[PDB]
Structures are given as structure tokens and as C-alpha cells.
Design a protein around this ligand. Structure first.
Ligand code: NI
Length: 341
């Protein structure tokens, strides 16, 4: 049964709640983004109205075959009316098509649901600035002060410089990047751009990227692996065995692999700077784990909440253990005492 933190009080609405069958009293199902823990349950047989971004709606139609008549895409940064309630979709700085949802309840309460997000000071100048928010349904993935990571820009600088150096030293090196969901496209696109190559990938992944409205994409990606020196593989294949096997398939075109796994956080973050990151190596294969996050760090999250000053916070992540829940509630109280709301 649907958990309380997926239900929007005073409405007929749910958020990211497609795996519970027909939810009692739900008149409209919102979907924040196309990640499987959030869309789990949708298919061509779904016949209730789904509200989402344009990009999410492209993916529902093309990847999951949801019929068009049930997809209701909304423009961003625009006041819209859904079943008699004003809503706004805002960019969540997560993966392509990911949104936060502002709900303006008929009684005057204003609710922000962040979906999954990476907080940023740029959000302090969207339509959020214009009214008070009473209740915050918060992505608390990294809600603990151990979670520090660099900016996305520092991480991409590291990856570009590393790949450019390796391939200039050895023009027969292949670069491989792992993926298993949408998101983090900058990693492989920025490396292909510095090398003057397209990114090669499976037909299924090319299909997915073609749903994303990324400008000039026909210019950056391809299904012709033979013409590409940056390849995308499933995340599960980014290990020494999987990469040795791939290099065999390339027919002697290449004699070295440099591979990247964009993780979120890993405990090498508490001791080491990005500058100082080193790969795991075996023979002619090297693997870099790079801390490219699409969720808020602890300090990014804290700054957003201290700016927004909500009256009540409802966590949406790490809610399954009493120790997690108690930890998070203690931080929320600190933040409120330090800022004075
Ligand atoms: Ni997500």
C-alpha cells in the first residue's frame, strides 16, 4: 500500500506512486522523472492521467509504450490547473526531464515536492522566491555531513583532462563510460567533444537519448561503434573481465582501455580531493570511479532548506529505519535553530 509521504493532502494527487495498483482516491498521478524506482508500475496498460515534463512524457510514450491520450506533459515555470488545483513544474537539476512540483492547495497551503534534486543557489531565483512554502517533501539521499562531493564542473574538468592526456599519449586507447539509467550524460558527451569523436552505443540506448531534447544530439552520438573512440556500456560491464571481453570485440583497433564509472558518493571522498583521484589498473585496463552526483550534498541541501524556511519537512529518502529517521530529524532541528525560523 502507498506510503503517506507519496500522497499530497487536500488533493486527489500522488507523486511517484505507480507500483501500488489503483490508489484509493487518486484522480491524477504525477511522475517527477524517468528513474525505475519512481516509474515502477507504468506500462501500455495504464489508463489514468499521468502528469509530467515533456521529456518524461517522450520517454513514457517511446520506452514504456504508455498511450498518448493518458500522457499530460506540462511546460516548466508556468502556472497550470490540474483537477482544479494550481501547480507549477520547476527544474530539479537531477537527470533530463526531472522536475520539482509546487502545489497551491485550495485552502491556501503551499507544498513543494522536490522529487530527486541537486539543490543549487539558482533555484533561489525561480518562482519559489514569490511565496511562502508551508510543507517540503525533501530528497534526503545524502542527508549527513559526511557527504561532501565536488561540483559537477570540477568532476567534468578532471574527466576531460584525463581522457585527452591518455588518448594523445596513445592514439590506440579506447575510452569506455558506464551507464544504467538516464542522467550524467555530460560525462560521456564532454569526453567525446574533447577527442573529436561521437559516442557509440547500443540501439536501445541511442533510442533513449533521442527522447531527451538535447541540442545538436545527432551531432554527438551514434550506433556505429566502429567509427567511435568513446563507447558506452552497461554499468555492470565496467570491471576487468567485462572490459577485456569488449576489447577483444574491437578486432585489434585498440590496445588499451581507459574506463569511467560515474558513481554518486564513495568514502574515498572523506580523505581525497578530485585532483588526487587514481584508477584501479590491471594490465592495459584502467578504471576511474568519479564522484559525479545528481543529488544534493549535505551542505547544498542545508543551504536550500535554510533559505526556503518551510514549516514542516517530510523526508522521501532513507525513511525505512528508525536510526535514519532520527538522524535526519536532528539535522532539521539544528538547521531551524541556527537560521531562526
Ligand atoms: Ni532519481
Amino acid at each position: 500500500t502507498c506510503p503517506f509521504y507519496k500522497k499530497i493532502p487536500g488533493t486527489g494527487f500522488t507523486v511517484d506512486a505507480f507500483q501500488y495498483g489503483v490508489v484509493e482516491g487518486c484522480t491524477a498521478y504525477f511522475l517527477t522523472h524517468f528513474h525505475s524506482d519512481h516509474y515502477a508500475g507504468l506500462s501500455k496498460h495504464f489508463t489514468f492521467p499521468v502528469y509530467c515534463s515533456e521529456i518524461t512524457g517522450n520517454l513514457l510514450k517511446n520506452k514504456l509504450h504508455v498511450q498518448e491520450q493518458y500522457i499530460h506533459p506540462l511546460p516548466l515555470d508556468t502556472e497550470c490547473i490540474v483537477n482544479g488545483v494550481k501547480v507549477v513544474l520547476l527544474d530539479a537539476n537531477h537527470c533530463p526531464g526531472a522536475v520539482m512540483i509546487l502545489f497551491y492547495l485550495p485552502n491556501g497551503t503551499v507544498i513543494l515536492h522536490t522529487g530527486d534534486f541537486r539543490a543549487d543557489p539558482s533555484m533561489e531565483r525561480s518562482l519559489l522566491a514569490d511565496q511562502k512554502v508551508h510543507m517540503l517533501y525533501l530528497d534526503t539521499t545524502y542527508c549527513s555531513p559526511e557527504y561532501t562531493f565536488p561540483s559537477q564542473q570540477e568532476v567534468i574538468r578532471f574527466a576531460i583532462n584525463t581522457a585527452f592526456e591518455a588518448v594523445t599519449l596513445n592514439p590506440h586507447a579506447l575510452v569506455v563510460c558506464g551507464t544504467y539509467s538516464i542522467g550524467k550524460e555530460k560525462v560521456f558527451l564532454a569526453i567525446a567533444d574533447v577527442l573529436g569523436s561521437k559516442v557509440g552505443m547500443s540501439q536501445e540506448k541511442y533510442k533513449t537519448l533521442q527522447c531527451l531534447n538535447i541540442p545538436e544530439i545527432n551531432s554527438l552520438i551514434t550506433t556505429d561503434m566502429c567509427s567511435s573512440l568513446v563507447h558506452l556500456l552497461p554499468m555492470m560491464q565496467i570491471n576487468f573481465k567485462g572490459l577485456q571481453s569488449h576489447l577483444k570485440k574491437c578486432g585489434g583497433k585498440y590496445n588499451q582501455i581507459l574506463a569511467f564509472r560515474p558513481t554518486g558518493w564513495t568514502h574515498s571522498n572523506k580523505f581525497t580531493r578530485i585532483a588526487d583521484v587514481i584508477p584501479q589498473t590491471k594490465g592495459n585496463i584502467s578504471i576511474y570511479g568519479i564522484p559525479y552526483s545528481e543529488h544534493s550534498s549535505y551542505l547544498e541541501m542545508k543551504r536550500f532548506v535554510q533559505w526556503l524556511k518551510p514549516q514542516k519537512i517530510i523526508p522521501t529518502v532513507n525513511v525505512g529505519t528508525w536510526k535514519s529517521r532520527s538522524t535526519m530529524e536532528k539535522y532539521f532541528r539544528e538547521w531551524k535553530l541556527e537560521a531562526g525560523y
